[PDB]
């Protein structure tokens with residue numbers, strides 16, 4: 267029981283575009299969360315073996331992390347801003363599913379999610 271391959275970060279059959287919303291997602295949303303004191307546990311895929319998380323990939327079938335989101339934004343993988351927002355939502359939700367209220371990682375995820383919500387509220391129209 268080890269880790270799956272990380273999520274894809276490049277799709278060569280998918281066209282690429284730069285938009286004002288995608289710029290905001292990289293330059294404000296991802297950058298702010300990535301640089302936060304609590305970001306390190308979320309900067310790469312969950313390594314259930316190194317972290318001793320039994321049954322992680324029996325419980326979480328749609329893993330996501332900020333390292334994947336950063337690479338997707340840097341590679342212009344996202345065509346729609348909603349794809350990126352959905353990945354951040356999946357990352358936080360998985361943490362809440364696997365862990366318990368009051369756990370250190372959940373309190374860290376909640377602080378990052380509050381900051382995510384504050385920044386996404388100012389996504390340009």
Ligand SMILES: Cc1nnc2ccc(-c3cc(O[C@H](C)[C@H]4CNC(=O)C4)c4cccnc4c3)cn12
Nearest residue numbers: 306307308312317319360361364365370371374
């Ligand atoms: C995402 C996601 N979803 N569930 C989990 C469950 C655990 C983790 C996790 C926790 C970590 O540290 C703990 C908060 C303390 C124990 N050791 C310390 O140094 C502090 C990590 C420290 C360095 C790198 N990666 C970590 C990943 C992330 N998780």
